[PDB]
Symmetry: D2
Subunit: 208 residues, 4 copies
Amino acid sequence: MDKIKQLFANNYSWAQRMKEETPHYLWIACSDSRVPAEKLTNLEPGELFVHRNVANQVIHTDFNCLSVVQYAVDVLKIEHIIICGHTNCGGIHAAMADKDLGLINNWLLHIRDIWFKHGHLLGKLSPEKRADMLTKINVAEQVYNLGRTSIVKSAWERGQKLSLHGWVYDVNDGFLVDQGVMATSRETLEISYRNAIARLSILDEENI
Amino acid sequence: MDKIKQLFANNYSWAQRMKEETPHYLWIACSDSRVPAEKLTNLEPGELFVHRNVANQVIHTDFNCLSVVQYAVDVLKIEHIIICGHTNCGGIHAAMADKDLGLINNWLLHIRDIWFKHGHLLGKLSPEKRADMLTKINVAEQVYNLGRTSIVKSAWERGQKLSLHGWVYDVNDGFLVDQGVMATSRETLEISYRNAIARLSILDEENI
Amino acid sequence: MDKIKQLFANNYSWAQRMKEELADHQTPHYLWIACSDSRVPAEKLTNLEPGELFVHRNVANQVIHTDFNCLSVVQYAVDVLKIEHIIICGHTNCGGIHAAMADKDLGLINNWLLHIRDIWFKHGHLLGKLSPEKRADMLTKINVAEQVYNLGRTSIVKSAWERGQKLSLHGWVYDVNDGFLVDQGVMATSRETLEISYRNAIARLSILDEENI
Amino acid sequence: MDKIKQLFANNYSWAQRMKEELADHQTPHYLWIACSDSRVPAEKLTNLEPGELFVHRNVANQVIHTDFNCLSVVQYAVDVLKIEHIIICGHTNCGGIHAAMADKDLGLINNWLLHIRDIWFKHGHLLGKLSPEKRADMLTKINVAEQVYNLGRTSIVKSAWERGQKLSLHGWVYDVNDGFLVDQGVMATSRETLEISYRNAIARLSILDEEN
Ligand SMILES: [Zn+2]
Ligand SMILES: [Zn+2]
Ligand SMILES: [Zn+2]
Ligand SMILES: [Zn+2]
């Protein structure tokens, strides 16, 4: 192992070079995302409370992610939760491949369920565009799952200001693109989710 | 919603400025650590595969983290997993506080079990230093847990090259500090864990 | 307190009776995944010999993709105990199904039951074609079919099949008023037979008797 | 395959018999958390009226702090069904305890059982004083004590107590050779009684008869 030594070297050089010269958002992103949230958003370290998992999921009964959410909402009183996906997501491609990759396959079955849920849409899409579309639909679905948590519903019910957001950044331009699901209440969840799916389901003439 | 608008402005300006101008590590870090791993390690982007949760835990039965680990080891063939803690960890402080914070308290009970495991040590330490020591002990314990997973044990059993590391990022100097648990095998895990705890139990003349 | 004291008295009485008036069946041959409501016990339903059932019970008998607890029961049952039959058993008048369908925030359990609500959505057209007082029991039946489908898609079961291990998956429901086990159609000995039977089962359930419309 | 066909014939036979020869107990009054081994069924052990038990079973009857499955059963039982008694029941000759104690990689289940191994090491001094053939049954007992302790530290149970809701936690073990439920000593109606009873139970288990 030389890569560990290289990492210590780079950390030392960075820290030295730098010295020579209340979080407000919960950010839920993917483990294989290339650009850190803070870089994408030009925020100061500490501004974001960050959870990262494979393919940026909010699975209904994932104690890990739900714990981060409950802590953020009920304890940190964070007012904004952002789910950020990205193009060329290895998690998404892994979910779409037909290989048993072992335990991770069970995690990615939730994504496969989303694929089936939108099977009519994705079936009408030319196969090479399907990954990008799934990546976007996934973000929309994860915001919907987040807004359906007991944690978020309760926060809203008691009058706590809390907004949910779902974006995708394209590795080809670094722009965050809103996928259209934005919730500040259960009604705005339902409406913007339906709206967003309808919009995502309009395919360019690369159909069937 | 101004904070969200600001984020889109920063992102746009960032990506414009930027244009006009195989992961090798699994990095398991804390959701409330402030400096991102990518910056701190000053590596090539995409070099890190990142999981972040509250208090950088590898819980034996956490599907989320174990999935990341299995994926990283069995599929990505990553050779280095690093658990990184950090000083002034809100997760650790939360674990040590006697408040019911709701669901997150269940997540942090694993940390409290670690505190009890090392209760004699921590009790001999002045109260204002205990959070600091628990944070370090926690990293050693999480590396131990990681090395005890079926995934890591199997990887080693079949002769796959895989190392586990446990560091703490020090905010006051930006340096990664090795906590001394470094495992390339079950035997090196046992020894370096025992070695690490023994070293961490030497308290500065600030006893009782 | 009196309920507990009475429980010990019931137990002591039964155990002592047994004495002055299981070990041969060390390894169970069936895994029974069922609901925590435990209306009619599996033993009563099946009249199997003592020890033959390995049992997991959770709210509304779910096999959630990423549930470490259930997946652990399944993996141990299949890879360690070498069980060749897994049965998912639902039941009518299921409190979990009823809670899942109710709008109330019951707290933590709502998150567990969101998986059943997803299933409800997944078959919303069909369930909307049913009379209101028939919907819970249709959702109970559909739930069981979906859980067999989930079980058969686990890495655990698929790997068992892929390496030639004999394993069958079953999904039944009984009416709590009569105790007759009814097969819901999803029965898998392979990924192919899972696909076919799952598809056929949903198609069959979508052909509504006019009583239920 | 014949086993299944037989099972349906048994069922039809029993159900048919019943017809030509539960609904009054729609809400159970006990939560029974026990092992998937299900050696002597809870109904047989307790002789309760049909429907009185709400049952969760998993390998080696664990209450893991972050297990959504068990915690969901517990929260539904406490907050929704308003159950006032939760019982954790272990049993001798537990395959999960035996698997926990063995060094074999059995795959995924090993991760679930790492929690039992943590308990094994937590009480490593005690368990080393026992004769090898007595260790599994001692770990079974300690396991139950520790799971009651975990249950009583859940946010679900602490909140129930905090708000004044009547709730008791129990931890029993039965010998598969005789069916007598034996109380392992951790019994909590409050956080304070949880602590005292937990400490007392471990102390009592630490006082060894003959078997060294
Ligand atoms: Zn990704
Ligand atoms: Zn932290
Ligand atoms: Zn039920
Ligand atoms: Zn057992």
